[PDB]
Amino acid sequence: GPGTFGTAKARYDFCARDRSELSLKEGDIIKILNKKGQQGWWRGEIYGRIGWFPSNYVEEDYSEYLPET
């Protein structure tokens, strides 16, 4: 399956014009849920807001969130 990848840090202040679109915002992270593929868009959420967003405006597998020491 798509499995859990991680997240996608937005690189461009997006603006969802609909409810089917994901509300991206530079300096924000996009929780990866599904990956249609290595081309198109990715399905994630933000602040509890689900939608779709391009992977050309976001960045994934950039950093990890290791647990506390």
Q: Render the burial of 28-59: b for 16+ CB within 10 Å, e for the rest.
A: bbbbbeebeeeeebbbbebeeeebbbebebbe
The whole-angstrom separation of Cα 7 and Cα 21 is 17
The whole-angstrom separation of Cα 45 and Cα 47 is 7
> Hey, where are the domains in the chain?
1-69
Instruction: Locate 17 and state its tokens.
Output: 């014009």
Fold that domain 1-69 belongs to in CATH: SH3 type barrels. (2.30.30)
Instruction: Locate 51 and state its tokens.
Output: 């939608």
CA angle 9-24-42, nearest 5°? 70
CB 1 within 8 A of CB 21: no
The whole-angstrom separation of Cα 41 and Cα 44 is 10
